[PDB]
Ligand binder design. Structure first.
Ligand SMILES: NC(=O)C1=CN([C@@H]2O[C@H](COP(=O)(O)OP(=O)(O)OC[C@H]3O[C@@H](n4cnc5c(N)ncnc54)[C@H](O)[C@@H]3O)[C@@H](O)[C@H]2O)C=CC1
Lengths: 125, 121
């Protein structure tokens, strides 16, 4: 809930919900890709006259018709919580910490908070 | 040789047990004789503590390139008349308990001489 609290702060700071300007645009681009695969096949197998009904799945349809802001949030979260684990796994090797993860958690934090004081000139003198 | 912060707050509590009575009588409002008591005792609980207290931490860089952490305080007692005036002290024994005390002391010091701004330290 810290991550989503960061997404709410941006929602309130862009003055628009997520995806309002893009859902119906990205919807049309999907159907033009399918209609492109259909046409392209029926130029090779098409003399046989067999139609090839390329259509979305019953799940990918349940993803288009109900595409809301809620999806983008539950996505940007699953991307944070993953890009961040790979950095704890890594640090747990660069220092040979084995299966001590808690220490590797704090070691990432300190090592990133350090790179901000160092390259800033902490003192204003 | 008693603690100091107890002394100051000791006077206020004593001096409020005196004025409390002659002060109910000189109120003008539509209340009971007991709703006024609950009004005087109540304001006197608001004047007593210190509104704001801060606490800081400094990244100073010594002359020899070192670093160390300075640690400060500032307490504004009252806001009833602005600004607030109060000195700054440099000493290795400046607690947060003695800053609250001396702040409250000026709000009353600069009231007996009718100087408008309130107290700080
Ligand atoms: N009748 C009485 O018992 C008193 C009358 N006065 C009168 O006030 C006039 C001038 O006093 P000034 O304060 O110079 O003028 P002012 O006109 O600016 O005073 C405003 C009022 O706030 C009070 N005051 C002043 N500093 C204060 C502070 N830090 N905290 C809380 N209250 C404060 C004053 O006693 C005054 O009644 C004169 O007429 C003088 O006689 C002052 C004190 C008592």
């Amino acid at each position: 809930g810290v991550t989503v609290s960061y997404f709410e702060w941006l929602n309130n700071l862009n003055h628009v919900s997520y995806g309002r300007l893009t859902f119906k645009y990205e919807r049309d681009s999907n159907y033009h890709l399918l209609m492109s695969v259909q046409e392209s096949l029926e130029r090779k197998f098409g003399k046989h006259g067999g139609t090839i009904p390329i259509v979305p799945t019953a799940e990918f349809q349940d993803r288009i018709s109900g595409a809301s802001e809620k999806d983008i949030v539950h996505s940007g979260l699953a991307y944070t919580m993953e890009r961040s684990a790979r950095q704890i796994m890594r640090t747990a090797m660069k220092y040979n910490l084995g299966l001590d993860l808690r220490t590797a958690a704090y070691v990432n934090a300190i090592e990133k908070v350090f790179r901000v004081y160092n390259e800033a000139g902490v003192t204003f003198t | 040789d008693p603690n100091f912060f107890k002394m100051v707050e000791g006077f206020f509590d004593r001096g409020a047990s005196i004025v409390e009575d002659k002060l109910v009588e000189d109120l003008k409002t539509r209340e009971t004789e007991e709703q006024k008591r609950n009004r005087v005792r109540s304001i006197l609980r608001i004047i007593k503590p210190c509104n704001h207290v801060l606490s800081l931490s400094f990244p100073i860089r010594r002359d020899d390139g070192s670093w160390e952490v300075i640690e400060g305080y500032r307490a504004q007692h009252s806001q009833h008349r602005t600004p607030c005036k109060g000195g700054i002290r440099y000493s290795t024994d400046v607690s947060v308990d003695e800053v609250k005390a001396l702040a409250s002391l000026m709000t009353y010091k600069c009231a007996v001489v009718d100087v408008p701004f309130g107290g700080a330290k």
